[model samples]
Target: QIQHIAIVGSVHGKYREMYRQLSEYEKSTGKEISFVICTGDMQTLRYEADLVYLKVPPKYKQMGDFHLYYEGKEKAPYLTLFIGGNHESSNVLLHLYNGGFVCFNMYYLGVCSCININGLRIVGVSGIYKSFDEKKPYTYPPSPNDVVSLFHTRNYVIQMLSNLSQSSQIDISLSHDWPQGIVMKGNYKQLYRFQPGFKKDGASLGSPINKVILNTLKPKYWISGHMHCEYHAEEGPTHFIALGKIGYKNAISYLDLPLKQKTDLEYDKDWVCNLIMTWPAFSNKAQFPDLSYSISELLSKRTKELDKKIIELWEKYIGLKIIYDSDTFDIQFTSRRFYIEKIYNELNI
Candidate 1:
């Protein structure tokens, strides 16, 4: 049960380039790379106006090949799964907080999600670490000051995933920044010697909170990008690997991960339990409510609340679910119709 996956560092909007390189890798190694897992900085700019939200210097801003894929001029050759990074068209990407296909073959693993690919259980915590908004619910059009900050790795992600580690297994954890403390865990001197500029790093290397996530969830493998250097280390039961940026010489790596098959993308039970626990956070405007209930109680209670309230009415009045018309949404998803359909299909309704 080996799933040969091609793990790439920050593509930085080099969708076509990444595919070109992967083909070269295939030709060179004679290995068929079925899955393309990008660490972050995918820069999936769906439109020209999305440029303002992209966190790159004015000179570095260019709409990359993604628009081609978005408009159907081009199609992704393989299954592409990516987590968001600091450099992203965040305005367009964060809409589907639960995660969805951004295009034909590309899927965005929302802010923090647990997705199962084959038998492999993956926990993805998007964005780098920043303490400012870790506790808040992700706002639609974030405040002017921290439009970029909304993507930072948050504490609740760890809270949601905490129960999963205790009850089951997490095969891999994906993040943009190298989880902090890997320097000490691996070989600090070598890191300093290689990426010498970081020897006197003032703000600590990689993400500090991610270090906390590393210990709490304790996944078997933790992969990251952003540091722009290839690094590998052993963190107790977990093995940590951070690939270099796309342009770097050692930017790509291959891993024969455990499996993928006839199953639909299933939700993680722990994630759902935790989401229900924080029901108030997303219910209103950013304020979270106080709720005391176990997983079973919450699951059953939520259903009862729904059933008792509007169960019969919604079945006949399905039109009420369409909150926004196509005109309301600024940018449309490539798999727009099916994307919305899949969300309802999963509902117990």
Candidate 2:
């Protein structure tokens, strides 16, 4: 069980401010934040071209500060994790579909995956709802330029979770979209009273896939984003929490879980679910024959492409010859910019 977990709503490519608050909270409270869970819309943009799918204005297109973490210049203050959302850097997240270290201590959850983090079983689905997109294969690559197609749902993901739910006991599940009609569940009627527009929108809002996940998995908590508001409901034993976008006053939240490890170990039998979590591994040939090599090969190709971009950026901006260390796979610049201080500094430059 985890001591304390800080869960934030959509980052949408703005993580710097939230990280600052977390640091200050730790300094003031003296309580360690064990993990930070980003409830999708992570939008880890790498280059100018990666902003094609984003719906933001021109000024905000290149506004992401996540590069400091992705380029190895900084590390997350805590173990940060996120899932993909409707608005994401399709290029950067495409290769990491198996879920990997987005940076030193930050992890991404692939389309449909689950992992045990410090005894807490955390699972996530990366995409949002769209009835048309649900018919396609879950592994369908996201569109680089199309916003609607960027993080569309798929049938395979829902099917996979449905299969896993038969055996595994999920502690928490994260989704970009809320389960349909969940807002109407508990004390949420006030939402309609406050903003009557939501009443009409709520009729067609949320994901059908999410409903399937909620009913099947029956996780202790189902946290979601995309609603752009805060809501809570209790459906029997399961608690549903929907958070608004980040930067809002109540965007970040905390929840605690039992320290005692869950006993029913049936999750071990859900082999495919485990493979999706671990990635690029298969015990039986017939089960995941093509999956084992796909992720590794994809990573290698994307690495070279991104490495080239990094080298070009350094030469263009800093006018320095960037050295790519093949042995360590780290980049070293010929000279550091004097104006910009070291990474993870408290002072805003």
Candidate 3:
């Protein structure tokens, strides 16, 4: 069996455009897409006023198609999963810092998140990277400057995302921007020729932070978009892909990975366990991971205890028993909890 996963580049809030293309592809090929992935810049404007929060020029903003879906006037064509991008409605996306349903069938990947669909271990990290604000804490009531930088990928976020153990797995990784130096693995001449300005960038085209996470995790396939071009490259076990914004010919791609059967997107065990192990830290502070602390050692120490609790939570939640254990699980009534609980129901909890 094959899980027909469709991948798209930046949507720029054009929900219908990408779906039409996917529909056309399905009609032409007779392939049933299991899910959809968007690299970034979906805009995801939930309200017309959210256009003001979008970083794009005021003149370029137009609420896009998400509001229709949000208001139940329309619905998604497939299970659409997206990471955050620089051009997002901070007012909307910030509410889902841990990822959740933005609307029916559309899921945000959070600041960083991992989920499993048909045993495919998909990891996604939202927003672009910026060095200046990378170390800053993600506090509530964000400063005027911080509000703008909230979409910028932070150092602590990368630290938390990459806390996977050696036992963990990653089949696919998604980022808003392409990892640094991956362009060298693909056709450089053509990429630079199309965008002459890129030649001056050399290998500095993408994010070094993303490169670090990519290198450490070493997923078999990685997808990203930001520059609005399409490229693919391979290095050892990793196949790196970059796509332009939506509406371009190369903006969309596909992967038919092995799948026994299609089912609800389940929680990744290791991800949830890691989330439990770090729950205390995550609940208490928004600061970056302590440099002196041995994250792996702590993770190792807490896994057995935390993993057991998480297993029970998963089972109970799936079986229709909800646990709002504020002691261990401190996340309150949030989009994150909404997501966790939704997965429970989808899984028959």
Best by lDDT: 3
Order candidates by lDDT, high to low.
3, 1, 2
* Count of residue pairs whose backbone atoms collide, per candidate: 1, 0, 5
lDDT of every model, 2 decimals: 0.68, 0.62, 0.74
Better of 2 and 3 by lDDT: 3
Kindly list the per-residue Cα lDDT of model 1 for residues 133-160, writing each as its tens digit.
Answer: 6655565444445566656777656555
Model 3 C-alpha lDDT versus the unseen true structure: 0.74
Model 1 clash count equals 1
Ranking by TM-score: 3, 1, 2
**lDDT against true structure, model 1:** 0.68
User: Model 1 — TM-score against the truth?
Assistant: 0.80
Candidate 2 wrong stretches, greater than 4 Å: 55-59, 138-147, 261-349
How many clashes would you count in candidate 3?
Answer: 5
TM-score of candidate 2 against the unseen true structure: 0.73
